[PDB]
Curated annotation (Swiss-Prot), chains A, B:
Complete-protein stretch covered: 705 to 794 of 910
Known role: Endonuclease that mediates miRNA decay of both protein-free and AGO2-loaded miRNAs. As part of its function in miRNA decay, regulates mRNAs involved in G1-to-S phase transition. Functions as a bridging factor between STAT6 and the basal transcription factor. Plays a role in PIM1 regulation of MYB activity. Functions as a transcriptional coactivator for STAT5.
Limits of the Tudor domain: 25-83
Subcellular location(s) of the protein: Cytoplasm; Nucleus; Melanosome
Top-level taxon: Eukaryota
Gene field: SND1
Coiled-coil regions listed in the entry: none
Record PTM Phosphoserine, positions in chain: 77, 81
PTM-bearing positions, type Phosphothreonine: 75
Quaternary structure note: Forms a ternary complex with STAT6 and POLR2A. Associates with the RNA-induced silencing complex (RISC). Interacts with the RISC components AGO2, FMR1 and TNRC6A. Interacts with GTF2E1 and GTF2E2. Interacts with PIM1. Interacts with STAT5. Interacts with SYT11 (via C2 2 domain); the interaction with SYT11 is direct. (Microbial infection) Interacts with EAV NSP1. Binds to acidic transactivation domain of EBNA2. Interacts with SARS-CoV-2 NSP9.
This protein's name: Staphylococcal nuclease domain-containing protein 1
Species this protein is from: Homo sapiens
Tissue and organ distribution: Ubiquitously expressed.
The record's account of how the chain is modified after translation: Phosphorylated by PIM1 in vitro.
Length: 90, 90
Protein backbone atom coordinates (compact mmCIF):
# COMPACT_ATOMS: atom_id res chain seq x y z
CA UNK A 1 0.00 0.00 0.00
CA UNK A 2 1.01 3.67 -0.44
CA UNK A 3 0.84 3.98 3.34
CA UNK A 4 3.32 1.13 3.93
CA UNK A 5 5.64 2.59 1.28
CA UNK A 6 5.54 6.12 2.77
CA UNK A 7 6.21 4.72 6.23
CA UNK A 8 9.22 2.79 5.03
CA UNK A 9 10.58 5.88 3.25
CA UNK A 10 9.79 8.27 6.10
CA UNK A 11 11.29 6.07 8.81
CA UNK A 12 14.45 5.58 6.73
CA UNK A 13 14.68 9.37 6.34
CA UNK A 14 14.12 9.99 10.07
CA UNK A 15 16.76 7.41 11.03
CA UNK A 16 19.11 9.33 8.64
CA UNK A 17 18.27 12.79 10.00
CA UNK A 18 17.24 12.14 13.60
CA UNK A 19 15.18 14.93 15.25
CA UNK A 20 17.36 17.28 17.31
CA UNK A 21 16.13 17.85 20.88
CA UNK A 22 14.43 21.26 21.18
CA UNK A 23 14.42 22.02 17.46
CA UNK A 24 10.71 21.21 16.93
CA UNK A 25 8.18 23.27 18.91
CA UNK A 26 4.65 21.87 18.90
CA UNK A 27 1.84 24.22 17.93
CA UNK A 28 -1.88 23.49 17.74
CA UNK A 29 -2.91 22.40 14.25
CA UNK A 30 0.60 21.69 12.96
CA UNK A 31 1.63 18.36 11.49
CA UNK A 32 4.65 16.64 12.98
CA UNK A 33 6.12 13.24 13.63
CA UNK A 34 5.40 11.47 16.94
CA UNK A 35 7.23 8.55 18.52
CA UNK A 36 4.64 5.95 19.52
CA UNK A 37 4.98 3.43 22.42
CA UNK A 38 6.57 0.94 20.00
CA UNK A 39 9.62 3.19 19.56
CA UNK A 40 8.61 3.97 15.95
CA UNK A 41 7.83 7.36 14.37
CA UNK A 42 4.41 8.15 12.88
CA UNK A 43 2.80 11.13 11.13
CA UNK A 44 0.79 13.19 13.59
CA UNK A 45 -1.11 16.43 14.15
CA UNK A 46 -0.95 18.52 17.35
CA UNK A 47 -4.42 19.04 18.86
CA UNK A 48 -3.75 20.59 22.29
CA UNK A 49 -0.77 21.81 24.26
CA UNK A 50 -1.36 21.12 27.97
CA UNK A 51 2.29 21.33 29.12
CA UNK A 52 5.83 20.69 27.76
CA UNK A 53 5.38 17.09 28.98
CA UNK A 54 1.81 16.77 27.71
CA UNK A 55 1.07 17.40 24.05
CA UNK A 56 -2.13 15.89 22.66
CA UNK A 57 -1.55 14.40 19.22
CA UNK A 58 -3.59 12.50 16.61
CA UNK A 59 -1.86 9.78 14.56
CA UNK A 60 -3.22 10.89 11.24
CA UNK A 61 -2.69 7.55 9.45
CA UNK A 62 -4.08 5.31 12.19
CA UNK A 63 -6.93 7.32 13.78
CA UNK A 64 -5.90 7.20 17.45
CA UNK A 65 -4.59 9.70 19.97
CA UNK A 66 -1.89 10.03 22.56
CA UNK A 67 -0.71 12.55 25.13
CA UNK A 68 3.08 12.60 25.04
CA UNK A 69 6.08 14.78 25.92
CA UNK A 70 7.62 17.32 23.51
CA UNK A 71 10.74 15.13 23.42
CA UNK A 72 8.85 12.50 21.40
CA UNK A 73 7.81 14.94 18.66
CA UNK A 74 9.74 16.09 15.61
CA UNK A 75 9.42 18.04 12.37
CA UNK A 76 7.48 16.29 9.58
CA UNK A 77 9.73 16.62 6.55
CA UNK A 78 7.90 17.97 3.47
CA UNK A 79 8.72 14.76 1.55
CA UNK A 80 6.23 12.95 3.82
CA UNK A 81 3.60 15.67 4.24
CA UNK A 82 -0.10 15.37 3.48
CA UNK A 83 0.68 17.08 0.16
CA UNK A 84 2.48 13.82 -0.73
CA UNK A 85 -0.06 11.38 0.79
CA UNK A 86 -3.35 12.37 2.50
CA UNK A 87 -4.05 11.23 6.06
CA UNK A 88 -4.74 7.48 5.90
CA UNK A 89 -6.83 7.01 9.08
CA UNK A 90 -9.53 4.31 8.75
CA UNK B 1 -20.49 -14.30 41.61
CA UNK B 2 -17.35 -12.25 42.57
CA UNK B 3 -16.66 -11.76 38.88
CA UNK B 4 -20.26 -10.64 38.20
CA UNK B 5 -20.18 -8.16 41.07
CA UNK B 6 -16.82 -6.70 40.01
CA UNK B 7 -18.01 -6.26 36.40
CA UNK B 8 -21.13 -4.45 37.50
CA UNK B 9 -19.20 -2.14 39.81
CA UNK B 10 -16.43 -1.58 37.22
CA UNK B 11 -18.87 -0.84 34.39
CA UNK B 12 -20.88 1.55 36.56
CA UNK B 13 -17.64 3.37 37.39
CA UNK B 14 -16.51 3.45 33.74
CA UNK B 15 -19.90 4.93 32.78
CA UNK B 16 -19.39 7.67 35.45
CA UNK B 17 -15.93 8.49 34.02
CA UNK B 18 -15.67 7.27 30.42
CA UNK B 19 -12.11 6.81 29.12
CA UNK B 20 -10.74 9.95 27.46
CA UNK B 21 -9.19 9.52 24.02
CA UNK B 22 -5.38 9.79 24.25
CA UNK B 23 -5.16 9.56 28.03
CA UNK B 24 -4.37 5.80 28.22
CA UNK B 25 -1.26 4.63 26.31
CA UNK B 26 -0.90 0.86 25.79
CA UNK B 27 2.32 -0.83 26.88
CA UNK B 28 3.17 -4.52 26.83
CA UNK B 29 2.31 -6.32 30.04
CA UNK B 30 0.12 -3.53 31.46
CA UNK B 31 -3.47 -4.09 32.52
CA UNK B 32 -6.22 -1.95 31.04
CA UNK B 33 -9.87 -2.03 30.15
CA UNK B 34 -10.86 -3.06 26.61
CA UNK B 35 -14.13 -2.50 24.81
CA UNK B 36 -15.23 -5.81 23.28
CA UNK B 37 -17.45 -6.28 20.20
CA UNK B 38 -20.58 -6.25 22.40
CA UNK B 39 -19.89 -2.61 23.30
CA UNK B 40 -19.05 -3.64 26.89
CA UNK B 41 -15.81 -2.98 28.82
CA UNK B 42 -13.69 -5.86 30.15
CA UNK B 43 -10.43 -6.21 32.07
CA UNK B 44 -7.49 -6.90 29.78
CA UNK B 45 -3.74 -7.13 29.49
CA UNK B 46 -1.65 -5.76 26.61
CA UNK B 47 0.33 -8.53 24.84
CA UNK B 48 1.81 -6.66 21.84
CA UNK B 49 1.69 -3.22 20.27
CA UNK B 50 1.58 -3.49 16.48
CA UNK B 51 0.41 0.07 15.68
CA UNK B 52 -1.90 2.75 17.15
CA UNK B 53 -4.84 0.93 15.50
CA UNK B 54 -3.62 -2.58 16.35
CA UNK B 55 -3.08 -3.50 20.00
CA UNK B 56 -3.09 -7.20 20.91
CA UNK B 57 -4.90 -7.80 24.19
CA UNK B 58 -5.86 -10.72 26.40
CA UNK B 59 -9.20 -10.57 28.21
CA UNK B 60 -8.02 -11.67 31.63
CA UNK B 61 -11.39 -12.84 32.92
CA UNK B 62 -12.40 -14.76 29.79
CA UNK B 63 -9.22 -16.15 28.15
CA UNK B 64 -9.59 -14.85 24.60
CA UNK B 65 -7.57 -12.39 22.58
CA UNK B 66 -8.43 -9.48 20.32
CA UNK B 67 -6.58 -6.94 18.21
CA UNK B 68 -8.13 -3.52 18.69
CA UNK B 69 -7.40 0.17 18.28
CA UNK B 70 -6.12 2.38 21.15
CA UNK B 71 -9.50 4.15 21.12
CA UNK B 72 -11.12 1.03 22.58
CA UNK B 73 -8.68 0.78 25.48
CA UNK B 74 -8.72 2.66 28.76
CA UNK B 75 -7.09 2.85 32.19
CA UNK B 76 -7.96 0.06 34.60
CA UNK B 77 -8.84 1.84 37.84
CA UNK B 78 -7.10 0.52 40.96
CA UNK B 79 -10.53 -0.39 42.48
CA UNK B 80 -10.93 -3.12 39.83
CA UNK B 81 -7.32 -4.27 39.54
CA UNK B 82 -5.95 -7.80 39.98
CA UNK B 83 -5.03 -6.80 43.53
CA UNK B 84 -8.81 -6.68 44.13
CA UNK B 85 -9.85 -9.79 42.17
CA UNK B 86 -7.34 -12.05 40.36
CA UNK B 87 -7.69 -12.86 36.61
CA UNK B 88 -10.74 -15.13 36.22
CA UNK B 89 -9.96 -16.83 32.87
CA UNK B 90 -11.20 -20.45 33.11
Amino acid sequence: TQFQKLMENMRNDIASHPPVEGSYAPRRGEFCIAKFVDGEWYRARVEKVESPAKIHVFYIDYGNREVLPSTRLGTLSPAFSTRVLPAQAT
